[PDB]
Subunit: 137 residues, 6 copies
Amino acid sequence: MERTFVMIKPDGVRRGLVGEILARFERKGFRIAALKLMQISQELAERHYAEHREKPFFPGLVRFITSGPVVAMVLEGPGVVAEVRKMMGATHPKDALPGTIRGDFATTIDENVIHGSATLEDAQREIALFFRPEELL
Amino acid sequence: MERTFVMIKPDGVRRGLVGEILARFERKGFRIAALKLMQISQELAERHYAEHREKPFFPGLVRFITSGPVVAMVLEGPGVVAEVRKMMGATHPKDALPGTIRGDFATTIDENVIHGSATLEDAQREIALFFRPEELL
Amino acid sequence: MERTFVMIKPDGVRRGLVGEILARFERKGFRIAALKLMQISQELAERHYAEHREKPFFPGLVRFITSGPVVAMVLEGPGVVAEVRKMMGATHPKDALPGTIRGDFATTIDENVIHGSATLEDAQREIALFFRPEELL
Amino acid sequence: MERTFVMIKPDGVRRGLVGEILARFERKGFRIAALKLMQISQELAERHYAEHREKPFFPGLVRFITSGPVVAMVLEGPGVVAEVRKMMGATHPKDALPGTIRGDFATTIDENVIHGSATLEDAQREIALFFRPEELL
Amino acid sequence: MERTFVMIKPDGVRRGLVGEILARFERKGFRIAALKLMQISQELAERHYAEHREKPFFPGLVRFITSGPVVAMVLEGPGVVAEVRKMMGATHPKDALPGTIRGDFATTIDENVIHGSATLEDAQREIALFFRPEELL
Amino acid sequence: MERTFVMIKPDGVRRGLVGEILARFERKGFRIAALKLMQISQELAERHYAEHREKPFFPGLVRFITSGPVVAMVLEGPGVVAEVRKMMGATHPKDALPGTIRGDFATTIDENVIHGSATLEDAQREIALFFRPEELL
C-alpha cells in the first residue's frame, strides 16, 4: 500500500502536459488515490519549502510554485516512491535521461515540470499538507 | 469564459483512460478550470439523475456511477460545451464515430466512459453540484 | 460472445502497422480470441474471393492478398462485427473518414490495409476458413 | 504525381504541433516533396489572400498569417489534394469532426492551425508562390 | 538473419498491451517472422521451465504462464537477441529503466509483462518448443 | 541562444519518421529556428565529411547521405547541443538506450536515422554549410 505525492508544476500545467504525464503513471499500473487542480497560496508554499526558509533560492521556489495552478496527486503501487523518482528522471533536466518525464519534457531546472516525494516520510508530509483526508480514495 | 462539466466515469478510471482523455482536451486547446478524483455519493448520483428517478433503469444508473471513483473536471474555452459534446461522440458507442472518445474507447451504453454537459444551462447546474465554488480556478 | 474475423493485409504488415492497429482494438475493449501471422495459400485466397472468380480483377485480388504475410485475427465483444466495420472505415480510402483505420493509414483501394467481416454470417465462414478450430481461444 | 500545398499556420508552429501533424501525413502514406520553415512576407500574404483584399477582415488575415513563422510543405500521392482536405477537416473548427486535424487541434476560425489547397488548380498556384522551383524534390 | 523469441505473458495480454508492444518492435525495424495467440499447457510450461524443475519457484512460474493466453512471436534483425533484451529492460521492473517495456508497463517481477530469449541458443530452443516449423515465415 | 544542427538522414525520411522525430524536439521545448527538405549534392556531402576525405569509409558516408532527400534543421534551447546528442542516443544503435531516437528507431550504424552536431563549433560549421543565412529565423 506504499504511496507517493506528485505535483505537476505550473509550467507543466500551462504547457498542457497533465494528461500525457498521468497516462504514463496509468500505463505503468499505478493507482490514482487522489487528484486535484489547486492554487498554492503564499503561506502554503512557504510551509512546504519550510526547510529552505533560510536558503537564498527560497523566494524563487515559492514564486514559481505559486505562479499558477498545479495538479496534485497521490499514486499507489509497489515501491512507488522510488519508481516515480526513477520515472521523473534527474531533478535537473540536463542530467535526466530520455524516457523519463523531465528528460522528455523539460529543459531548465527552474521549470522542470514535475515534483515527486523523495522518501516515504516526505510523501506522508506532502500528502498531509496538500490534501484533506477525505480527498484520499 | 464558457465552461462545461466533464466526468470520466468509473469504467474510464478503472481502465486507466484518465490521462489519455485529458490529453485530448489539452491538445484541443481547452483550459482545465477544475479537476478532482472523487467518489460520487448516493445523494449526488440521485441528484444528478433525478430526471430518471421514476424510470426502471434508474437504480442501475446510480449503482454504476457510484461503483468506483470518477474524475470530475471543468473545461474552459470558446464554445467548449458544444465542442466537448462533439469530441465525446454519440452517447451510445454504437453510434459514436471513430476519432471520438466513445468511438475509440467504449463498447456498451451502460459503460460509456464519459459524460459532458449537454447545454450551457446543464453545465452551470452540474458544475455547482459536483464542485465547491472555491474549487473553480 | 459475438466474434468477427479481421486480417491486416500484406501492405499493412509490410508498412509496420500491425501493433498500431491491434492497439486500437485493444483500447476499444475488444478481446483477441485468435491471432497469427500467416501466408495465404493460393487455395485460401481463391476460396476467400470465390465470389469474384469470374471478375477480371480477380487475378489481381489474389496476387495482392498473397503477395506477403498477413496477420489474421478474431476479435470478440458486444456487436464487434458492426463496430469493427465502423472502425475500419469505408472500403475505398477516398471515402474513409479520418479517425478510421483506412482513413488514417490507406491511400488506394487495391492496398487498403485491412479487412473485416461484413456480417455475422461472413464472420463464421471466414473464421472457419482462416483458422483451425483449436486456434480459437 | 498529384501534389498539394500545405501550410501549418503560425499558431500551429507556436503550439508545437508541426511533428504531430507531419506524422499524420507520413502515416497516411503521402510523400514529402518539399518542406521549409519560413516567415511569410507582407507581399506573399497579400498575394495569397488577394481574393479578400477588399473584405474588411483582410487586414486581419494578413497580420495573423505573418504573426510568426509557418511550416510550408508539398505533399505528393494519389488524390492527395482531396485527401488532405478531408484530413484537415472543416475550415471552421466548430464543424470539424474529431479525428480531423482541425477537429483535434483547433478551437477558433481565426487560428485554425493549418491550410491545404482547395483544388488541383489552387495547388499549382500556391506551390509556385511559396516555393522556389528548385525546392521541389 | 539472427532471430529471437518473445512472449507477451498472460498479464500483458489481459491488460491490452499486445499492440503497443508489437508497435515498439515494428518502429525499431525488426521483422515479425512468426506470431500467434496460444494457451500454454501444463506439460508445455513445465518443459519450458525444465531447468528450474527443482527450484522452489518452479510451480509459481508454471502457474502464471498458464493463467491465460499469451502472444508468442519471433523477431528478426541485426543482433536482435541482445537488442530485444535491452528493449525489455531488467527482469525486475523496479530495476528496469524508463523507456524500456518493463520500465514503462510493469511494477512486479511476477507479472513483468514480457519474456525474451537470453541467448541465441535459448531462442532456438524456445522457437522449436512454442512454434511448429511451418509457422515461421 | 545556443543552437545545434540536426539532420534526419535519407533512411529516416523514407521510413516516414520525420514528424515523430520533430515531435520529440517540440515536446521537449526546443525551438525550430530553421527547417527544410533538401537533396545533398556529391560535392556538398564531400565538403561536410571533408575531415574524413582520407578515411576508407568516406565513400560510404557520401553515398548514403546522398541516396535520397534529407530533412535539415536548427534547434535552439538551453544546452541544446549536448541535450540533442543525449536524445539521439549512441551513434551505433546497438549501444543506444531505449528512449533515445536511435535506440527506438534504428538497428544499424550505416542507417542510424539521424545526425546531430557534436559540438557548438561543429554546429556553426554545419549550419553555415547546409543553410543560407536568410533561412534562419
